[PDB]
Ligand binder design. Structure first.
Ligand SMILES: [Co+2]
Ligand SMILES: [Co+2]
Ligand SMILES: [Fe+3]
Ligand SMILES: [Fe+3]
Lengths: 296, 296
């Protein structure tokens, strides 16, 4: 008992097995789905999510971490229906995904009030259920570290200090937002090894990626920049000894509403790696050992 | 049959009666209510809304226009429950309330696609019901006319040209956003008399308010700046002959989630006006004749 699972008893982090650290069963904007439901088909979303999870399981995936949070349409009851249909271990999270400003709710509200929402989901449960959050997700992108973006980062640090759950980020690989997230969180007392700086596979600036890993945090070679170039960067990082900081995901959304699959790393990335000399222990380090330490 | 009403057959605009043009039965951020429902109490919200509507009816209000739209938690089923409990004529709208950027859904989507959402609500119905929207609501504030704010303004103009429903805006009274909204909409072909530029009672810069009214649009002396100063501005505008452009509302939210009543104009504003020489025909112009023309 250590990592909460949707629809299941919690599991020890040592038992997580082969893990996909950043996959979305579904993603959507809460406000536009509430206001224009005619744009959406939950039944198609459900079928797609179950099919994708089943395909991942066929390749040996035990556990999927789904970092859908506020702003991207987290729905714990949908998640538990997918678990019932598949038997996957599913880790849900809490957090806020914003690039610029917070919803109007947060006007005149403190960082502590924001952290209390995260702690509520970790300690009490998500959306009125007893399913608990196992990590915090935060974001920054092209607008950089705005005032509200920084509030959310600081609230994630408070939640981590109180509950010890790790932090996954979304960053923009072409600016310094990932480095800034790592800096702010570690300055606030977060263990660097409890942070995954995401979307670093989007750039080929290896020195920037290595800088973040060298500071202690996992580097998300997620969103599986052409895969060939991504693979080249991934291979380069492996060849240079960074396997124990690398996390690979697809950042695949089985259904997204914005105006490819959860097994591409099995059909393309992992075969490419293997064809270029990467052995089995590297694959196990990335997909089993790194998530075990992240959640340990 | 001309203005759609929640839970009722449509009514001719000539039969709207005494109207409150800008009141919220409820307002909230869709994403934070979806993600943290423990923060909200629908039963309290419902009781408050019914009580406020009943009090307005006791003062002679026939029709209430509720400009809650995407971003502020529009819920047509809540609205119809309030209508069932009170018998009020309630006009619901469509639109998007943003100050900076659109939800991620709208990435790579056209102004025409946005207008199609508004036209859907006006012609087909809101949120899977047969209750239709009777106006479009848009906003701009301190960030000014951003790219996404302007997209929404231009989509409102398309919806108005297709369906002839009027447009209500939120503006910031201390910058030129209201003037800019009016300019963009009229440049796109919207009749100036089909536009209410809102939140102009927030400033005492009478020349700015008069400029908008002189260009043909209604001026929202809503949000009933101290009421005394608001009343002074309202009285001044009346004394200067602007009654036939003035719309008074409270912009009262019977429940808002951000970190006073719908009858304050009956307890304070209207008595103050009357005490300062304003007669009955002015009150009738503001609250009956102006909304009739707006919706005509
Ligand atoms: Co991301
Ligand atoms: Co407003
Ligand atoms: Fe993601
Ligand atoms: Fe309002």
């Amino acid at each position: 008992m250590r990592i909460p699972l949707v629809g299941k008893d919690s599991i020890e982090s040592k038992d997580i097995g082969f893990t996909l650290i950043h996959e979305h069963l579904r993603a959507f904007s809460e406000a536009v789905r509430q206001q224009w439901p005619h744009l959406y088909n939950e039944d198609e979303e459900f079928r797609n999510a179950v099919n994708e999870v089943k395909r991942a399981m066929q390749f040996g995936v035990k556990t999927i971490v789904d970092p859908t949070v506020m702003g991207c349409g987290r729905d714990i009851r949908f998640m538990e229906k997918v678990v019932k249909a598949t038997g996957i271990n599913l880790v849900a999270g809490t957090g806020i995904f914003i690039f610029i400003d917070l919803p109007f709710y947060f006007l005149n509200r403190s960082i502590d009030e924001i952290a209390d929402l995260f702690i509520h989901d970790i300690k009490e449960g998500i959306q009125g259920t007893l399913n608990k959050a196992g990590f915090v997700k935060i974001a920054a992108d092209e607008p950089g570290i705005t005032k509200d973006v920084e509030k959310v980062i600081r609230a994630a640090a408070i939640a981590n200090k109180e509950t010890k759950v790790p932090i996954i980020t979304h960053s923009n690989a072409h600016n310094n937002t990932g480095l800034e997230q790592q800096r702010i969180l570690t300055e606030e007392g977060v263990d660097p090894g409890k942070i995954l700086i995401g979307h670093l596979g989007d750039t080929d600036n290896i020195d920037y990626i290595k800088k973040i890993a060298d500071k202690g945090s996992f580097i998300g070679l997620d969103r599986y920049l052409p895969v060939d170039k991504r693979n080249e960067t991934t291979l380069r990082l492996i060849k240079d000894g960074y396997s124990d900081k690398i996390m690979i995901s697809h950042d695949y959304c089985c259904t997204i509403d914005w105006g490819l699959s959860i097994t591409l790393i099995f059909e393309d990335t992992i075969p490419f790696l293997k064809r270029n000399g990467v052995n089995e222990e590297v694959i196990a380090t990335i997909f089993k050992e790194n998530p075990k330490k992240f959640f340990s």
